[PDB]
Design an enzyme around this catalytic site. Sequence first.
Site, PDB file in Angstrom:
ATOM      1  N   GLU A  42      30.506  -7.973 -10.184  1.00  0.00           N
ATOM      2  CA  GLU A  42      31.574  -8.424 -11.132  1.00  0.00           C
ATOM      3  C   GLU A  42      32.256  -9.862 -10.576  1.00  0.00           C
ATOM      4  O   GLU A  42      32.215  -9.788  -9.301  1.00  0.00           O
ATOM      5  CB  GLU A  42      32.761  -7.329 -11.415  1.00  0.00           C
ATOM      6  CG  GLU A  42      33.781  -7.801 -12.435  1.00  0.00           C
ATOM      7  CD  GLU A  42      34.947  -6.971 -12.413  1.00  0.00           C
ATOM      8  OE1 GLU A  42      35.363  -6.368 -11.620  1.00  0.00           O
ATOM      9  OE2 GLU A  42      35.739  -7.136 -13.406  1.00  0.00           O
ATOM     10  N   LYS A 124      32.881  -6.684 -20.956  1.00  0.00           N
ATOM     11  CA  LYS A 124      33.517  -5.286 -20.430  1.00  0.00           C
ATOM     12  C   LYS A 124      34.564  -4.643 -21.274  1.00  0.00           C
ATOM     13  O   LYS A 124      35.296  -5.329 -21.867  1.00  0.00           O
ATOM     14  CB  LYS A 124      34.382  -5.929 -19.103  1.00  0.00           C
ATOM     15  CG  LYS A 124      34.786  -4.768 -18.166  1.00  0.00           C
ATOM     16  CD  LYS A 124      35.740  -5.460 -17.308  1.00  0.00           C
ATOM     17  CE  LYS A 124      36.224  -4.336 -15.826  1.00  0.00           C
ATOM     18  NZ  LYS A 124      37.180  -5.060 -15.052  1.00  0.00           N
ATOM     19  N   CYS A 166      32.893  -2.395 -13.559  1.00  0.00           N
ATOM     20  CA  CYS A 166      34.114  -1.879 -12.550  1.00  0.00           C
ATOM     21  C   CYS A 166      34.890  -0.764 -12.934  1.00  0.00           C
ATOM     22  O   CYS A 166      34.427   0.229 -13.213  1.00  0.00           O
ATOM     23  CB  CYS A 166      34.680  -2.947 -12.372  1.00  0.00           C
ATOM     24  SG  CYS A 166      36.050  -2.937 -10.917  1.00  0.00           S
ATOM     25  N   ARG A 170      35.293   4.707 -14.690  1.00  0.00           N
ATOM     26  CA  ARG A 170      36.457   5.900 -14.687  1.00  0.00           C
ATOM     27  C   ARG A 170      36.436   6.560 -16.118  1.00  0.00           C
ATOM     28  O   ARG A 170      37.137   7.623 -16.111  1.00  0.00           O
ATOM     29  CB  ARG A 170      37.742   5.495 -14.448  1.00  0.00           C
ATOM     30  CG  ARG A 170      38.053   4.885 -12.974  1.00  0.00           C
ATOM     31  CD  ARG A 170      39.618   4.549 -12.853  1.00  0.00           C
ATOM     32  NE  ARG A 170      39.834   4.326 -11.457  1.00  0.00           N
ATOM     33  CZ  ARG A 170      40.424   4.760 -10.401  1.00  0.00           C
ATOM     34  NH1 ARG A 170      40.210   6.230 -10.387  1.00  0.00           N
ATOM     35  NH2 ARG A 170      40.300   4.361  -9.133  1.00  0.00           N
TER      36      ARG A 170
HETATM   37  C1  LIG Z   1      39.763  -9.787 -14.375  1.00  0.00           C
HETATM   38 AS1  LIG Z   1      39.018 -10.361 -12.808  1.00  0.00          AS
HETATM   39  C2  LIG Z   1      37.252  -9.576 -12.053  1.00  0.00           C
HETATM   40  O1  LIG Z   1      38.647 -12.109 -13.070  1.00  0.00           O
HETATM   41  O2  LIG Z   1      40.112 -10.519 -11.623  1.00  0.00           O
END
Ligand SMILES: C[As](C)(=O)[O-]
Lengths: 304, 303
Positions: A42, A124, A166, A170
């Site tokens: 990510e 996401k 990510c 969960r």
């Molecule tokens: C929401 As992010 C993976 O840019 O800290």
Amino acid sequence: KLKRVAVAQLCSSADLTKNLKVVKELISEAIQKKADVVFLPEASDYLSQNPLHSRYLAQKSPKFIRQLQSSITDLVRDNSRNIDVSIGVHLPPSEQDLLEGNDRVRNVLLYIDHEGKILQEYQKLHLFDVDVPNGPILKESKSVQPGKAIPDIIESPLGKLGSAICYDIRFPEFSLKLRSMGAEILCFPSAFTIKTGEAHWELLGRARAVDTQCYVLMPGQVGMHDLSDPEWEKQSHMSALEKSSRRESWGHSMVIDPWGKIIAHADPSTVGPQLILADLDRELLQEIRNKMPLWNQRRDDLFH
Amino acid sequence: LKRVAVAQLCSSADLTKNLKVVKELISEAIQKKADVVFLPEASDYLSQNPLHSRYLAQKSPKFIRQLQSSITDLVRDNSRNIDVSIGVHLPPSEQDLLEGNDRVRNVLLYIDHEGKILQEYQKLHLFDVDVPNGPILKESKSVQPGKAIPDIIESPLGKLGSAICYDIRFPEFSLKLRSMGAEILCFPSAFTIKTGEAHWELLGRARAVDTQCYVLMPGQVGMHDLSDPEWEKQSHMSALEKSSRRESWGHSMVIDPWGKIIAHADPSTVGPQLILADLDRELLQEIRNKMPLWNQRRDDLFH
Ligand SMILES: C[As](C)(=O)[O-]
Ligand SMILES: C[As](C)(=O)[O-]
Ligand SMILES: C[As](C)(=O)[O-]
Ligand SMILES: C[As](C)(=O)[O-]
């Protein structure tokens, strides 16, 4: 009968140009080691200091991606060998998003083939809005807009791929859906916290693997991120006091088989970029599913 | 804080001997001031085959009735209340037989301090598995699957969601129980060695973390002797057809909503044992507050 996968671990800065160099090197190494697909974490384009910083950097991501597409085709050409790339990036909001008063960035997992063609943009679904135990209040939804779509199963060189990002890990019903749709492999590219990583990272990967009888790929960010951006700090009139950052990611990138066995794992002796390789066994996956036919045994009459 | 007891035992085919062990464990749980005690799947008996199970199931109603009396006796004698969660079998009903369903029921009973059965949960997911490096098992040959999601029980420890063994592998079930209000989940089990060594701890911790619930894992342990001379004579069985050996994983444990093992069976003690845990409602609430998973689900897409 075996298919080779590469999983990348890295430490994104706020500098897209420097991040791209790292990404290109890891893809180059993946082709060298004859991986059919390489999976990167990510936010492999950037991590940012705050929600305004993210929107600023998201405006630079289309260029990063165009350059990446070109890098992939260049590398495929020069190595006389194909590779596909799965990589977490950010994208700016669309005109329709803006029309509706939504200027948040899209947290997107790209699947790019050997011709540099983008096959999927998975936005996401579950955003990390959590009070970390002995740690900060984090609200991803302040910078990121949630997706509205379940990602299609990707027919990759490795087999049927289910995409996730990510925090998605969960919510077991998501992984269950991906398997129900035909997934053989799940990926969870991540920028995972230290506190929750130590507790749950390995547990969650192994759980999702055993739940779904799929190979599970876990590309993770690692280390203390350098979020410095002097030109943006100048533009936003930020004091040295507000400049500081100690954002840290768990790492421990790994590959897990459909029985919950870790078959490849990042070397903990470096917090720099690294690649892990694994050979995936379709026969083993099929055997496991034959012996314990979970998907023939569900109670759809009561659940779903 | 509310105190739970989780029992580990080793069922034979002798319901009388099994009942003695069950009574001893409930007595021990009262001594230790546990408010509810949880016993494994098949605490009444384990059988050699489908025909043995059908024979033994006929004896199960007497076992249950004697247990109900034993619970009120222990509570009265000790002057302390306890509730009992226990896996047993029930024979097919009259209606089952008429409808061509001559299979036993794999049931988890919740029996309160008054000896009243508050819930009869019939196992939904039956263990039909070719165990890797082990035997080929097909539970549905002798057992009929359940028809209902079990209601949440307002136990002395809090909101309890109930399940049996294989049930643990289907996450939608545990997710639904949490959606219904569960604070605690139980998975009484006769778990195999080969899948136990692989997945027992993993699955327990996963469900706990998945649902932000305390998870209770009462398991059968060790080598079983399912010998039954009286039955073996009646069915005119040859010694070559006898299948009286079974092994169970044990490792009974209690897990917190964060996935931490807070109580675990002692690997050095052989046979029946009890583990105790003090459950913390405030820890549970804090975990749920900080990571509000149930406010963050995508029902628009998955439900
Ligand atoms: C929401 As992010 C993976 O840019 O800290
Ligand atoms: C990564 As694009 C700007 O082609 O959607
Ligand atoms: C083998 As059984 C149906 O008594 O758990
Ligand atoms: C063969 As059996 C379900 O009685 O253990």
